Each structure stands twice: as C-alpha cells, then as structure tokens.
C-alpha cells in the first residue's frame, strides 16, 4: 500500500523540502493530486527495507552513489525521458544516473569540491599546484600557511591523485569495467608523490583533520583550503572574506574530483509511475521547480542548464559546476566502499612515511579489488544463508 | 579386484534392471560375455568411492545432471559413436551428454513435465496460461478448481518463470558462460508476476506442496495438475479418467520445463571399453533393445527416434517428448545446486508477499553468485583438512615415517 | 641504510659475494662510489620489510621465483637494457624477469635439473624413459637399480609429467592466463601413467625421498639420478666417477624441468638508480664480472652468452644449460604456491595407487584453482582486517560454514 492516485515523496529533512511541497502544491492545483512530502529518519537506510516489501514512497530524492544499491535490488523502476528532454540537463550528469546501461533516476543537483581562498592575504589564487611550495615559504614569513586541508580522508586528496592519470574504475559505455583499477599508473604515483613531497619539504602538515582544516581557515591562519559547498555556511559566520574558484592544475592537467549528484528515482512497486514521472518532468525540472526548492535550502549547482545559467552569476556556484565538469562521477557500484578503505590505508601510510608512494598505491590495488569481493561474497552469503535457514524454520515454529 | 573383464552394470532399482538381463542374453550369445547387473543402494554417492579408486562398474545408467560431477572428476571416459549413429537419436539429447565439448555418455530416455487434466471436467484443455483465472471461477461454481500444483519448488514453478525468457546459465557453444544468469530479465519478471497474481487474486493457494497437489487431482478436487511420469501409476490406481498434453503457453511463448535425460556412461578405469561401447551402441540402442527394458519398467519417451514413434502412439509419451523438445536441458554443472536454493527462496518470498517480484528476484542473482563461490571453496576446505591434514600427518607420515 | 650517494648490495651468505666485492672495489675506483656487499639473514624476508619503508639495499640478488611478490608489492623498479644488451644474454632468461609486461631485474645464473649417471655401472646413458624398464632388469641381476630419485617432491617428478604436453599456467607473450592450469591434458595423463606404471611394474620404488636417492647414488647402489648442481659437491667427496647429461626424452618429446634464474633487482626507493644500473650493466655481467663471482663460489650456467660458452667446456655446465633451454621457466606469480601443493597430493595419491591418473590429474587443477583463492585471498584480507581495521606450512582459516540439512 504505497499509494493509489497520489504522490508520496521522500527527501532528506535538511533539503529544500518545503520548496518541493510548494511545487507539489502547484502540481495539485493543476491535476488534482495530493502530493505528500516526507522526511523520515535515515530514509536511505529505511527505504530499501520497505520498498522491498512494496511499500513506502513513490519518489525518493538522494545522492546517486546510494542508488546503485537500490537499482540493483530491483527497488527502482527505469525512467523514460525522450531525447528532447534529455538535452535539457547536462551530458555528464545523465551518466551518473545509469545502472546496467539504462537511466534509473532524474538528476537534481550537483556536488563538487572547489578551491576556497582568502582574498585578503591572497587576492590572486594559483593556477597550478607547483607554486604552492613557493607560496608556503612566502606565507611562513607572516606566520601563515598557503594551504591547509584534511589529508585523513581520501575524498579530499583524490583530486590530486587522479589529476595526472589515475582513476578508480574504468567507466566503459555505462558499464564500469571493474577489472581496471587505476591506482597504479604513473599518474596516480606522481600525484601522491607530490602530496607527500609537500609534507616532506615542510610546505604542509600531516595531522590535519577536517576539524582542524575548516577551523584553520575561519580564523584566517591559512591562505587556502579545499572544500565543497557544505562549508560555505561557516565562512559567512567567521566574517572572513572568501573567494571560490577552480582547483589548481597538476602537471598542467586539470584536477579530477569525485562528483556526486542529488537525484530522484521512482519506486518499483509504486503504481502511480506515470504521475511520479509527470511531476518530475515538467513541474520540478522546470526553471521554477528548482527556483522554489532553492529558496528554502540552496542546492548549489543544478542539473538543468537553463536554470544553471541563471544561478551562474554567483561565483561559488559558477566554480562548483566548472570543477564538476572536469571531475569523475563517484561510481555507484558496491565495490566502491572497499576502494575507499584501501585508498585510505594507502594515503595514511604514504604521508606517514610507512611506505614509499609506489609501494602503498600498488598495495592498495592488490588489497582493493581482491579485498573488495572477499568479504562481499563471504558476508553477503553468511548473512543470507544463515538468515534463510534462520527465518525458514522459525516461520513454521511460530 | 579391478571391475573384472566382464561388463558389470550398475543401476538404481526403480528402472527395469531385470530387462537388461534379457539384453545380456542376446549379448552372451554372439560375443559370449557374462553381463551381470548389480542394483546398489544410494549409489549416486557410492560411485565416486569405488570408481574413484579404480574399481566400480564398467557402465553406469543415471540422470545426466549427476554426470557432470562424475565427468569433471575424470571418472568417465569420452566416447565417439558413428556420425550416422548420432543421427539415430534426437539432436537435443546429445547436448545433454557433453562436457567442455566432449560427449561423455549414451542417452537412453528423456523426461519432462507435462499438463495433466481430468477429461471429465476439462474435455478440451487450455493452451494458454492467461485463461487459468477465467477457468477457475467457472469451476469454482461446481465446487472445484482450475489448476493445482506444487509451489514450494522451483522445479514445478520454473516452467512458468522461464516461459517468457528466463533461464539459468547461458548455453552458447558446447559450454556454459556462468557469469550470465537469467532469473532477472523481463521474461523472468513477467512470469513470476503472473504466478503471484493467481495466488493473490485467489485463483490459487500459496502453501500447496506436492502431497496436497497429487492427492487433490486423484480425489477430483482439481481439473488440472502439472506433474511427470512418476505419478502416472498413481492416477492409474485412482480410477480417474485422466488425459495428458503439452504445457500451457504463456505470452504466446511455449512453457519450458526442465528436462532429464537418463544416460549410461563408461568409467575411465574400465579396460573393457570396446565391449561396453559395442553392447551399448548396438544391442541396447537397437529398436528392440529398448523394448526389453521398457517391458520390465516403462522408460517413458526415449532418445532413439525409430522406437519413439512405436510408443508415441500413446499420447502420454508423445506429450512428454513434445514437452521435452521445447524445454531446458537441466545443466550438469556444480553451480546448478545453488540456482535451486536461490529461486527456492525467491519464489517463496514472492508468493508469501513478504517481498515483491523484482525485489526477491534480483536477490537470486546476488545469492547465486554468493552461494556458489563458498560451496566451491568449502569442498577444498574439506579437502585441505583431508589431504594436507590426513595425507600430511595422519596416515603414512605417522603410520610409517613416525 | 637508505644509502644516498653510494651503493649497498645484498646477495646471500654462500654465493660469490667476495667476487662481487672485488667488482665493488673495481667499480669504486673508476667512478668514486664505494660499493658495499652485505649478506643478511633470511634476507628474502627482510627485504620486503625494510624495502617497503624506503630502507634496505639498492640492489638485491635472488632467484626470480620470489621476485614476483617483490615486483607486485611495488618494491622493485623497472629496468631498461638497450637493444644491444638484450641480445647479449640468452633470450629465454629475459622471460624469467618480466612482470605485467615489464622487466624487473637482471638475470645472472641458470639452474635446471639434469641427468647424473655413474660412468662405471653405465658408460653410455639412455636417452629415453622407455629404456628404463629394460635397463632396470639388466642391473637388477648385478644387484643394482637403473634409476632412483626423489618421489615425495613435484620439483623432481614434474619434468616427466610435463614432458608430453603438460604445464603449470600459460605463457604466450609476456603474461600468464592463470585460468589455464594444464595439469590435466593427455600429456600429464600419459606422463604420470608412465611413472605410476614403473612403480607397479616394480622397476622402481615408491617411498623414495631426497636423502635416500642422494645416498644410494653416492654409494653406487643405483646407476642414475635426476638432480641439480647443488648435489655435485657431495658426489665429488664420494669419489664416484659421475657424468651429467640431458634428461631422458619421453614419447619422442624433450623432458621439461623448471628453470630457476638468479637475478639482480634495483629497489624502487634507491635514489642512485643510475649507479645501480651502470654497475650491473657495464661491470658485473661482462665476462670478467662473473669471472670474479664464479671464482669465489661457482655459479653454474650463466645468463651471459660469452662467459657461458667458456664455462660450457665443463660437461656438467653445458648439460645444465641444455636442460634449461628445454625446461620451463618457473612462474613467479602468487598462485604457484597452491599449484605445488596441488600436484604434491596428486602425485602422492597416484603413486600410492589410491586414485586413477585421470582422477588425480583432474582433481589436482580443481584443488589448485580453489586453493588459489582459499589462501591467497583469505589470508590476504584476514591479516588486513586484522591490522587496517583493528582497534612451507598452511595453517587454515575460519569462519562458520554451516550447510544443510
Ligand atoms: Ca518532450
Ligand atoms: Ca528554510
Ligand atoms: Ca518388436
Ligand atoms: Ca532453446
Ligand atoms: Ca645495513
Ligand atoms: Ca679502471
Ligand atoms: Ca648498448
Ligand atoms: Zn525529518
Ligand atoms: Zn623547499
Ligand atoms: Zn523566475
Ligand atoms: Zn481475477
Ligand atoms: Zn651471512
Ligand atoms: Zn615389466
């Protein structure tokens, strides 16, 4: 009992859900359909629980990375946008929303790391990573630092590593070639070498965690930090005059940051599949649909070109999109979670001086793809196999 | 002990074993060799203990699915029958007895599921699945039911799931590309959807096992049941005037039931190779040779064309063969055992309503890839504590080198 | 040590480290870089500890067989021998020091099983295995056996099993198709069948290890035995007129022993790679270079052509090179560990007569492909989850494998 001639939608309670209900209210006045917008506890964990029984929302708004886990479990139905509508958003986005070579959701917003500098002590930010050794020495004169960011998290260091040539998995025609990890090619090796070199030369530091990093920019002790939109709402509080632009280029090559995409899919057992697709087609994905959601909580850079250009005037949005346009979509696959853990145990050891670059990266590849399925096959089996035998005889033992 | 120079034969019991002694009589005359037949108990597991060591029977009659594991263990010897002899049997029975491109057994009899109907309620049975709902209410008025067959089983339900396009492991070129299941494509979805509908719309029950099915048709409480030749004798004793025909077609596509070709194979450690392949190729696989066994215990439809027509006059056999022709040759690989438990839980979840079609169904592919691996890792685990444990320290090394 | 501006070399306490050291003070004078030659304990284990951290020697001398885990763990650096230098060595040795298509070391010495025969009991040695039966009866009368070698080992039996057409994996350009395990084809069957036939035929015993075969030869109880260069020294002390020649041919085809190649690899962390390459190229590996090492302690067959044709004068050396050119460059991949164990139990079973040739040979490769992931993957995450999450002998893992009922 998901619905019956109405649209109940799910979206995280920190989003522009009030602006969405306004789009649902304008939708109601136009067709005659009651559009409930909800925002329950850890929905992304509770959704695959009820949607498996055939219940819950008609539509669910979430970042694409968590969608592959639904799209595989047959919880999302395939969408069907005509080519006329497919051109309205962006070429790179659609690619973030296909599972098994077929579109599984409508992309809403976008999320990419950008370079945040202090215009007061640094009015013209660097175009490359190569003057940062030059810039830190100059900054050390006034008791300041050129760069200070979280090295304890792979997502933050990945823009540099993947800048020259490195890549997580090889995306081939809407079908990631899983057996093609790229944390070994000279590009990934030269990248991480540079990162550790800055730690060695003392142009940077090692124990910089997110707590320290963000709070080192708000007091104005550093010239630059790399961080995504979620940080903007803290630089305003700190008064600090802040500029946002494209990341610096390494070896002349543009940096590759991982790009998430807030997207909305349609439930597999949601009878109102037409209305759900109807609401999303020309009520939310229209200029206003987003303008209305944007007012409640700004969603950064949007998927829709037409409204993306209207929002482009804002430099921060303008740069986030430019960073996203040369970035790699964070793979929506299940082995992605093992990659992160592998690359994390790499960069921690590489920076610490436990393993020389070339060794820890080549180790990551061996204990990434191989330790990806090892537990997967085992856990996924020992969970379902025991569960199967646990639930079966207990059903008759009730 | 080495199997002996005579042709020693093993065979379960249910089949016409005394019928082989009559074939051994035509064989003891021309070539003059004593053809014994042992009827062992639980031999489907006692074979890789005697034939593994170099003993066991020269020949073994058994369903082809079990022959994969025998074949893979190197216990069975490859055969090469005449190209003209191969055309003596149905081309589809040949693909049943192959491993990695190599023929490893002689096909005897086929066996597929078929529609069984009570002539005194359905004088003309439906060719279409879609008419099951309409026929149910028409019979419910008389206090009856349209169809009733086992649901706690993938063997019986699969025919419908597979009907549209759903398959186990893909067969391409005398092999199985295992990394290519098909319990999730549109076909497999459309099928199980339809089956779950008859359950929720009350045209059909959910908790129906085999016991309730077979009996209800014998008691005349249903007008159709899906079953094989193993229940023919029971409906003979029920005194119920029953028919039998080709399975109902879903979505204009023929329903595909799992096949089961009974076959004989010559084991590797059986030096009496030529005799076996002589006796089997000619003496048993003659027009008359099959009569002999069939006369003891009926074999159902047979792989041999010429003799097939002879029995095909009985519609019961003609439809078993017509349904085998258009079905899945039950793959003889190790991963197949997993396919069962995964669909087993998939179909029971879909029927009880606790999950849904696409939901419980997409799980089966994840369960198929997850169950197969550990089973194909646990049989080495048992071997590591029996070859690197028992062979390394229990026996010889402690029994002589202590 | 980390070095920086110098050259620290690890070899092995028993090889011609002195001869290498003389090349050390030779190179030292020509450039200005003092070369140190050290011989640590169990260095084959020590290297992947200290090298992984950016310490250890600049170059390492070891059998390419273990260089696979070094090249894979990213500890060794890629080399670049010019086209002219490539041709200077025996073509087949270059295949020994390749990883994922890349060269990861310089080959030095070659070591392959040979055929050692007593000249007194048997002047002209048999060139075929099919003659072993008839030769055995001939010697049985005089109270002697024709051949006795190690049977509780696949490194000694394999040469025959593979002689017909079998192999470990598949090398067809510069890679291994690991899903190819060829211990099952007619070759292996016909091979092992012959060997097992000999045991049942009583032409040879079943409970023969190394120590027995080495002793029975040296005492002159047997005519022939299969053994590498390492056993020569003991036959020298036994004063038994021995000769070494090519292995007996089976079914017309040459026999096939696994080839080992001593190699000199350069650490990835070495700041002075240029010196390491210049020392290993233009010094040690030119006639005189090896001439030094060989004099402190013999090397056997050598990767270099010029100095080989001069060493080959010794019949035994030219017979190791003959055997090696027909041998099977032993794979350095991590799967090789399981393969050995697999064949070990396959032969121990076939010899004892428990299972048929066809069974033991099919059951070998299934136990091998299952074993390849049972430990190389299981013990790989087992220790990773143990540490990165945390807060000779297989010793099997957990967890709970509940089946049925
Ligand atoms: Ca349109
Ligand atoms: Ca608000
Ligand atoms: Ca007749
Ligand atoms: Ca077909
Ligand atoms: Ca030292
Ligand atoms: Ca000089
Ligand atoms: Ca040159
Ligand atoms: Zn909420
Ligand atoms: Zn500096
Ligand atoms: Zn407007
Ligand atoms: Zn109905
Ligand atoms: Zn020493
Ligand atoms: Zn003999």
Curated annotation (Swiss-Prot), chain B:
Transmembrane segments: none annotated. One of its GO terms (cellular component) is periplasmic space. GO terms for biological process: carbohydrate transport; cell chemotaxis; detection of maltose stimulus; DNA damage response; maltodextrin transmembrane transport; maltose transport. It is found in: Periplasm. Gene3D superfamilies: Periplasmic binding protein-like II. InterPro entries: Maltose/Cyclodextrin-bd, SBP, SBP_1_CS. The keyword Transport applies. Induction: Induced by maltose and the transcriptional regulator MalT. Permanently repressed by cold shock in a PNPase-dependent fashion. The keyword Signal applies. SUPFAM superfamilies: Periplasmic binding protein-like II (SSF53850). It holds the Pfam family SBP_bac_1. Keywords: Periplasm, Signal, Sugar transport, Transport. Its main location: periplasm. It comes from the Bacteria. One of its GO terms (molecular function) is carbohydrate transmembrane transporter activity. PANTHER family: MALTOSE-BINDING PERIPLASMIC PROTEIN (PTHR30061), MALTOSE_MALTODEXTRIN-BINDING PERIPLASMIC PROTEIN (PTHR30061:SF50). The complex is composed of two ATP-binding proteins (MalK), two transmembrane proteins (MalG and MalF) and a solute-binding protein (MalE). Part of the ABC transporter complex MalEFGK involved in maltose/maltodextrin import. Binds maltose and higher maltodextrins such as maltotriose. Belongs to the bacterial solute-binding protein 1 family. This is Maltose/maltodextrin-binding periplasmic protein. The gene is malE.
